[PDB]
PDB file of all heavy atoms in Angstrom:
ATOM      1  N   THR B 663      -7.130  37.114 124.238  1.00  2.00           N
ATOM      2  CA  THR B 663      -8.316  36.572 124.861  1.00  2.00           C
ATOM      3  C   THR B 663      -8.753  37.321 126.102  1.00  2.00           C
ATOM      4  O   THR B 663      -9.949  37.300 126.458  1.00  2.00           O
ATOM      5  CB  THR B 663      -8.085  35.081 125.259  1.00  2.00           C
ATOM      6  OG1 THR B 663      -7.006  35.039 126.205  1.00  2.00           O
ATOM      7  CG2 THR B 663      -7.686  34.270 124.035  1.00  2.00           C
ATOM      8  N   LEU B 664      -7.857  37.994 126.800  1.00  2.00           N
ATOM      9  CA  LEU B 664      -8.138  38.795 127.976  1.00  2.00           C
ATOM     10  C   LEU B 664      -7.565  40.193 127.827  1.00  2.00           C
ATOM     11  O   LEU B 664      -6.342  40.389 128.080  1.00  2.00           O
ATOM     12  CB  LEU B 664      -7.586  38.132 129.247  1.00  2.00           C
ATOM     13  CG  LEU B 664      -8.193  36.770 129.623  1.00  2.00           C
ATOM     14  CD1 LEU B 664      -7.371  36.192 130.770  1.00  2.00           C
ATOM     15  CD2 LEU B 664      -9.691  36.868 129.968  1.00  2.00           C
ATOM     16  N   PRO B 665      -8.361  41.169 127.431  1.00  2.00           N
ATOM     17  CA  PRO B 665      -7.795  42.512 127.160  1.00  2.00           C
ATOM     18  C   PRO B 665      -7.058  43.168 128.317  1.00  2.00           C
ATOM     19  O   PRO B 665      -6.156  43.985 128.056  1.00  2.00           O
ATOM     20  CB  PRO B 665      -9.026  43.332 126.754  1.00  2.00           C
ATOM     21  CG  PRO B 665      -9.899  42.321 126.121  1.00  2.00           C
ATOM     22  CD  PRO B 665      -9.719  41.031 126.884  1.00  2.00           C
ATOM     23  N   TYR B 666      -7.395  42.869 129.564  1.00  2.00           N
ATOM     24  CA  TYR B 666      -6.659  43.519 130.645  1.00  2.00           C
ATOM     25  C   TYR B 666      -5.190  43.126 130.672  1.00  2.00           C
ATOM     26  O   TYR B 666      -4.388  43.790 131.355  1.00  2.00           O
ATOM     27  CB  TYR B 666      -7.304  43.267 132.033  1.00  2.00           C
ATOM     28  CG  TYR B 666      -7.008  41.925 132.710  1.00  2.00           C
ATOM     29  CD1 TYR B 666      -5.834  41.768 133.471  1.00  2.00           C
ATOM     30  CD2 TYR B 666      -7.893  40.875 132.611  1.00  2.00           C
ATOM     31  CE1 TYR B 666      -5.574  40.547 134.092  1.00  2.00           C
ATOM     32  CE2 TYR B 666      -7.622  39.666 133.250  1.00  2.00           C
ATOM     33  CZ  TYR B 666      -6.471  39.503 133.966  1.00  2.00           C
ATOM     34  OH  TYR B 666      -6.230  38.299 134.583  1.00  2.00           O
ATOM     35  N   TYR B 667      -4.814  42.055 129.958  1.00  2.00           N
ATOM     36  CA  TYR B 667      -3.379  41.758 129.775  1.00  2.00           C
ATOM     37  C   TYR B 667      -2.686  42.868 129.008  1.00  2.00           C
ATOM     38  O   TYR B 667      -1.483  43.071 129.189  1.00  2.00           O
ATOM     39  CB  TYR B 667      -3.224  40.450 129.013  1.00  2.00           C
ATOM     40  CG  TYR B 667      -3.317  39.189 129.852  1.00  2.00           C
ATOM     41  CD1 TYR B 667      -4.000  39.215 131.071  1.00  2.00           C
ATOM     42  CD2 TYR B 667      -2.752  38.007 129.442  1.00  2.00           C
ATOM     43  CE1 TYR B 667      -4.093  38.073 131.853  1.00  2.00           C
ATOM     44  CE2 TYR B 667      -2.834  36.853 130.177  1.00  2.00           C
ATOM     45  CZ  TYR B 667      -3.519  36.880 131.387  1.00  2.00           C
ATOM     46  OH  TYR B 667      -3.595  35.720 132.136  1.00  2.00           O
ATOM     47  N   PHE B 668      -3.398  43.599 128.167  1.00  2.00           N
ATOM     48  CA  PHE B 668      -2.799  44.665 127.371  1.00  2.00           C
ATOM     49  C   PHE B 668      -2.875  46.026 128.059  1.00  2.00           C
ATOM     50  O   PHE B 668      -2.533  47.045 127.456  1.00  2.00           O
ATOM     51  CB  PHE B 668      -3.441  44.702 125.988  1.00  2.00           C
ATOM     52  CG  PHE B 668      -2.852  43.670 125.024  1.00  2.00           C
ATOM     53  CD1 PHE B 668      -3.091  42.314 125.207  1.00  2.00           C
ATOM     54  CD2 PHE B 668      -1.992  44.086 124.021  1.00  2.00           C
ATOM     55  CE1 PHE B 668      -2.514  41.381 124.386  1.00  2.00           C
ATOM     56  CE2 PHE B 668      -1.407  43.115 123.176  1.00  2.00           C
ATOM     57  CZ  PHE B 668      -1.670  41.780 123.356  1.00  2.00           C
ATOM     58  N   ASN B 669      -3.302  46.078 129.304  1.00  2.00           N
ATOM     59  CA  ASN B 669      -3.201  47.294 130.090  1.00  2.00           C
ATOM     60  C   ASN B 669      -1.841  47.344 130.779  1.00  2.00           C
ATOM     61  O   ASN B 669      -1.712  47.256 131.994  1.00  2.00           O
ATOM     62  CB  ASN B 669      -4.365  47.409 131.085  1.00  2.00           C
ATOM     63  CG  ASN B 669      -4.378  48.730 131.822  1.00  2.00           C
ATOM     64  OD1 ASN B 669      -3.914  49.751 131.298  1.00  2.00           O
ATOM     65  ND2 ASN B 669      -4.919  48.712 133.053  1.00  2.00           N
ATOM     66  N   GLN B 670      -0.809  47.488 129.950  1.00  2.00           N
ATOM     67  CA  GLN B 670       0.531  47.525 130.473  1.00  2.00           C
ATOM     68  C   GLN B 670       1.096  48.948 130.360  1.00  2.00           C
ATOM     69  O   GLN B 670       0.724  49.701 129.450  1.00  2.00           O
ATOM     70  CB  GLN B 670       1.465  46.573 129.737  1.00  2.00           C
ATOM     71  CG  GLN B 670       0.996  45.118 129.770  1.00  2.00           C
ATOM     72  CD  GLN B 670       0.925  44.545 131.169  1.00  2.00           C
ATOM     73  OE1 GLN B 670       1.620  44.981 132.080  1.00  2.00           O
ATOM     74  NE2 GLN B 670       0.073  43.542 131.373  1.00  2.00           N
ATOM     75  N   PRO B 671       1.948  49.370 131.313  1.00  2.00           N
ATOM     76  CA  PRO B 671       2.519  50.728 131.250  1.00  2.00           C
ATOM     77  C   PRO B 671       3.350  50.962 130.005  1.00  2.00           C
ATOM     78  O   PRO B 671       3.466  52.114 129.563  1.00  2.00           O
ATOM     79  CB  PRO B 671       3.369  50.794 132.527  1.00  2.00           C
ATOM     80  CG  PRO B 671       3.664  49.376 132.859  1.00  2.00           C
ATOM     81  CD  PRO B 671       2.451  48.595 132.455  1.00  2.00           C
ATOM     82  N   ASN B 672       3.944  49.923 129.428  1.00  2.00           N
ATOM     83  CA  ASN B 672       4.730  50.047 128.193  1.00  2.00           C
ATOM     84  C   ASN B 672       3.849  49.937 126.947  1.00  2.00           C
ATOM     85  O   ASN B 672       4.385  49.726 125.853  1.00  2.00           O
ATOM     86  CB  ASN B 672       5.829  49.001 128.153  1.00  2.00           C
ATOM     87  CG  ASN B 672       5.318  47.580 128.339  1.00  2.00           C
ATOM     88  OD1 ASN B 672       4.826  47.223 129.414  1.00  2.00           O
ATOM     89  ND2 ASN B 672       5.364  46.780 127.283  1.00  2.00           N
ATOM     90  N   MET B 673       2.542  50.062 127.083  1.00  2.00           N
ATOM     91  CA  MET B 673       1.634  50.131 125.959  1.00  2.00           C
ATOM     92  C   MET B 673       0.764  51.371 126.097  1.00  2.00           C
ATOM     93  O   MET B 673       0.525  51.880 127.190  1.00  2.00           O
ATOM     94  CB  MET B 673       0.733  48.885 125.868  1.00  2.00           C
ATOM     95  CG  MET B 673       1.490  47.634 125.606  1.00  2.00           C
ATOM     96  SD  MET B 673       0.464  46.171 125.789  1.00  2.00           S
ATOM     97  CE  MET B 673       1.632  44.921 125.277  1.00  2.00           C
ATOM     98  N   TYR B 674       0.239  51.853 124.966  1.00  2.00           N
ATOM     99  CA  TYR B 674      -0.559  53.063 124.970  1.00  2.00           C
ATOM    100  C   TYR B 674      -1.567  52.994 123.831  1.00  2.00           C
ATOM    101  O   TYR B 674      -1.189  52.740 122.673  1.00  2.00           O
ATOM    102  CB  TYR B 674       0.306  54.292 124.819  1.00  2.00           C
ATOM    103  CG  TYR B 674      -0.342  55.589 125.311  1.00  2.00           C
ATOM    104  CD1 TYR B 674      -0.002  56.110 126.539  1.00  2.00           C
ATOM    105  CD2 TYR B 674      -1.266  56.225 124.521  1.00  2.00           C
ATOM    106  CE1 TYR B 674      -0.578  57.298 126.991  1.00  2.00           C
ATOM    107  CE2 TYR B 674      -1.865  57.397 124.978  1.00  2.00           C
ATOM    108  CZ  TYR B 674      -1.512  57.920 126.200  1.00  2.00           C
ATOM    109  OH  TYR B 674      -2.115  59.086 126.640  1.00  2.00           O
ATOM    110  N   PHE B 675      -2.860  53.226 124.141  1.00  2.00           N
ATOM    111  CA  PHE B 675      -3.904  53.350 123.143  1.00  2.00           C
ATOM    112  C   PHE B 675      -4.336  54.787 123.033  1.00  2.00           C
ATOM    113  O   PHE B 675      -4.734  55.386 124.036  1.00  2.00           O
ATOM    114  CB  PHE B 675      -5.105  52.460 123.487  1.00  2.00           C
ATOM    115  CG  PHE B 675      -4.859  50.992 123.327  1.00  2.00           C
ATOM    116  CD1 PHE B 675      -4.310  50.255 124.373  1.00  2.00           C
ATOM    117  CD2 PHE B 675      -5.175  50.322 122.143  1.00  2.00           C
ATOM    118  CE1 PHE B 675      -4.074  48.880 124.231  1.00  2.00           C
ATOM    119  CE2 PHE B 675      -4.943  48.975 122.005  1.00  2.00           C
ATOM    120  CZ  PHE B 675      -4.386  48.255 123.058  1.00  2.00           C
ATOM    121  N   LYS B 676      -4.278  55.369 121.848  1.00  2.00           N
ATOM    122  CA  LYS B 676      -4.659  56.764 121.656  1.00  2.00           C
ATOM    123  C   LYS B 676      -5.690  56.892 120.566  1.00  2.00           C
ATOM    124  O   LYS B 676      -5.438  56.492 119.423  1.00  2.00           O
ATOM    125  CB  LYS B 676      -3.459  57.630 121.327  1.00  2.00           C
ATOM    126  CG  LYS B 676      -3.775  59.115 121.417  1.00  2.00           C
ATOM    127  CD  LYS B 676      -2.727  59.966 120.747  1.00  2.00           C
ATOM    128  CE  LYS B 676      -3.157  61.436 120.767  1.00  2.00           C
ATOM    129  NZ  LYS B 676      -3.510  61.970 122.126  1.00  2.00           N
ATOM    130  N   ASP B 677      -6.834  57.486 120.891  1.00  2.00           N
ATOM    131  CA  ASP B 677      -7.830  57.823 119.884  1.00  2.00           C
ATOM    132  C   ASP B 677      -7.350  58.988 119.034  1.00  2.00           C
ATOM    133  O   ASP B 677      -6.871  59.995 119.561  1.00  2.00           O
ATOM    134  CB  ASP B 677      -9.164  58.207 120.546  1.00  2.00           C
ATOM    135  CG  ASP B 677      -9.872  57.046 121.205  1.00  2.00           C
ATOM    136  OD1 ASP B 677      -9.557  55.886 120.872  1.00  2.00           O
ATOM    137  OD2 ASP B 677     -10.755  57.307 122.048  1.00  2.00           O
ATOM    138  N   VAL B 678      -7.430  58.836 117.718  1.00  2.00           N
ATOM    139  CA  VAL B 678      -7.053  59.884 116.781  1.00  2.00           C
ATOM    140  C   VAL B 678      -8.146  60.010 115.725  1.00  2.00           C
ATOM    141  O   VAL B 678      -8.937  59.097 115.505  1.00  2.00           O
ATOM    142  CB  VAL B 678      -5.684  59.629 116.146  1.00  2.00           C
ATOM    143  CG1 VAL B 678      -4.609  59.701 117.230  1.00  2.00           C
ATOM    144  CG2 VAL B 678      -5.665  58.296 115.434  1.00  2.00           C
ATOM    145  N   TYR B 679      -8.161  61.153 115.053  1.00  2.00           N
ATOM    146  CA  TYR B 679      -9.197  61.467 114.110  1.00  2.00           C
ATOM    147  C   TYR B 679      -8.538  61.941 112.806  1.00  2.00           C
ATOM    148  O   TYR B 679      -7.560  62.689 112.841  1.00  2.00           O
ATOM    149  CB  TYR B 679     -10.157  62.539 114.692  1.00  2.00           C
ATOM    150  CG  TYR B 679     -10.770  62.064 115.989  1.00  2.00           C
ATOM    151  CD1 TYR B 679     -10.110  62.218 117.207  1.00  2.00           C
ATOM    152  CD2 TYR B 679     -11.995  61.382 115.996  1.00  2.00           C
ATOM    153  CE1 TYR B 679     -10.656  61.753 118.386  1.00  2.00           C
ATOM    154  CE2 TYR B 679     -12.536  60.918 117.180  1.00  2.00           C
ATOM    155  CZ  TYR B 679     -11.874  61.109 118.364  1.00  2.00           C
ATOM    156  OH  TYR B 679     -12.413  60.657 119.544  1.00  2.00           O
ATOM    157  N   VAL B 680      -9.073  61.489 111.670  1.00  2.00           N
ATOM    158  CA  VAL B 680      -8.518  61.842 110.371  1.00  2.00           C
ATOM    159  C   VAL B 680      -9.429  62.856 109.692  1.00  2.00           C
ATOM    160  O   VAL B 680     -10.608  62.587 109.463  1.00  2.00           O
ATOM    161  CB  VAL B 680      -8.309  60.611 109.486  1.00  2.00           C
ATOM    162  CG1 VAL B 680      -7.629  60.997 108.219  1.00  2.00           C
ATOM    163  CG2 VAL B 680      -7.490  59.603 110.226  1.00  2.00           C
ATOM    164  N   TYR B 681      -8.872  64.004 109.371  1.00  2.00           N
ATOM    165  CA  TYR B 681      -9.597  65.119 108.771  1.00  2.00           C
ATOM    166  C   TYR B 681      -9.258  65.206 107.286  1.00  2.00           C
ATOM    167  O   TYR B 681      -8.129  64.973 106.894  1.00  2.00           O
ATOM    168  CB  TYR B 681      -9.257  66.439 109.458  1.00  2.00           C
ATOM    169  CG  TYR B 681      -9.469  66.418 110.976  1.00  2.00           C
ATOM    170  CD1 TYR B 681      -8.401  66.345 111.860  1.00  2.00           C
ATOM    171  CD2 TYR B 681     -10.752  66.495 111.492  1.00  2.00           C
ATOM    172  CE1 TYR B 681      -8.613  66.308 113.233  1.00  2.00           C
ATOM    173  CE2 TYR B 681     -10.971  66.446 112.851  1.00  2.00           C
ATOM    174  CZ  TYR B 681      -9.900  66.384 113.724  1.00  2.00           C
ATOM    175  OH  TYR B 681     -10.138  66.355 115.073  1.00  2.00           O
ATOM    176  N   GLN B 682     -10.251  65.536 106.469  1.00  2.00           N
ATOM    177  CA  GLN B 682     -10.042  65.705 105.048  1.00  2.00           C
ATOM    178  C   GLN B 682     -10.028  67.203 104.712  1.00  2.00           C
ATOM    179  O   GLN B 682     -10.883  67.938 105.227  1.00  2.00           O
ATOM    180  CB  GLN B 682     -11.142  65.004 104.227  1.00  2.00           C
ATOM    181  CG  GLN B 682     -11.089  65.246 102.720  1.00  2.00           C
ATOM    182  CD  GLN B 682     -10.245  64.223 101.963  1.00  2.00           C
ATOM    183  OE1 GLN B 682      -9.503  63.453 102.570  1.00  2.00           O
ATOM    184  NE2 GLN B 682     -10.391  64.206 100.634  1.00  2.00           N
ATOM    185  N   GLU B 683      -9.059  67.649 103.937  1.00  2.00           N
ATOM    186  CA  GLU B 683      -8.951  69.018 103.480  1.00  2.00           C
ATOM    187  C   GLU B 683      -9.241  69.077 101.990  1.00  2.00           C
ATOM    188  O   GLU B 683      -8.859  68.152 101.245  1.00  2.00           O
ATOM    189  CB  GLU B 683      -7.555  69.569 103.779  1.00  2.00           C
ATOM    190  CG  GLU B 683      -7.560  70.939 104.475  1.00  2.00           C
ATOM    191  CD  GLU B 683      -6.760  70.918 105.774  1.00  2.00           C
ATOM    192  OE1 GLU B 683      -7.303  70.489 106.812  1.00  2.00           O
ATOM    193  OE2 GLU B 683      -5.563  71.338 105.745  1.00  2.00           O
ATOM    194  N   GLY B 684      -9.891  70.150 101.553  1.00  2.00           N
ATOM    195  CA  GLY B 684     -10.246  70.305 100.147  1.00  2.00           C
ATOM    196  C   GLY B 684     -11.433  69.454  99.763  1.00  2.00           C
ATOM    197  O   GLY B 684     -12.237  69.025 100.614  1.00  2.00           O
ATOM    198  N   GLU B 685     -11.556  69.199  98.464  1.00  2.00           N
ATOM    199  CA  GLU B 685     -12.644  68.390  97.924  1.00  2.00           C
ATOM    200  C   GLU B 685     -12.671  67.001  98.523  1.00  2.00           C
ATOM    201  O   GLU B 685     -11.628  66.339  98.600  1.00  2.00           O
ATOM    202  CB  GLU B 685     -12.534  68.309  96.393  1.00  2.00           C
ATOM    203  CG  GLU B 685     -12.462  69.640  95.661  1.00  2.00           C
ATOM    204  CD  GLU B 685     -13.827  70.220  95.278  1.00  2.00           C
ATOM    205  OE1 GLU B 685     -14.852  69.692  95.780  1.00  2.00           O
ATOM    206  OE2 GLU B 685     -13.875  71.173  94.459  1.00  2.00           O
ATOM    207  N   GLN B 686     -13.866  66.540  98.896  1.00  2.00           N
ATOM    208  CA  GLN B 686     -14.000  65.191  99.431  1.00  2.00           C
ATOM    209  C   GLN B 686     -13.946  64.124  98.355  1.00  2.00           C
ATOM    210  O   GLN B 686     -13.578  62.988  98.637  1.00  2.00           O
ATOM    211  CB  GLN B 686     -15.272  65.071 100.263  1.00  2.00           C
ATOM    212  CG  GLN B 686     -15.387  63.692 100.917  1.00  2.00           C
ATOM    213  CD  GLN B 686     -14.458  63.480 102.111  1.00  2.00           C
ATOM    214  OE1 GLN B 686     -14.050  64.450 102.776  1.00  2.00           O
ATOM    215  NE2 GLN B 686     -14.024  62.237 102.343  1.00  2.00           N
TER     216      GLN B 686
END
Side-chain angles (χ1 to χ4, degrees):
Chain B
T663 62
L664 296 172
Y666 81 85
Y667 278 23
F668 278 70
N669 185 28
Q670 303 298 335
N672 55 292
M673 296 171 175
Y674 201 103
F675 289 86
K676 192 195 175 54
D677 291 340
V678 295
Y679 303 85
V680 185
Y681 304 106
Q682 174 90 349
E683 230 125 278
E685 304 271 12
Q686 183 75 25

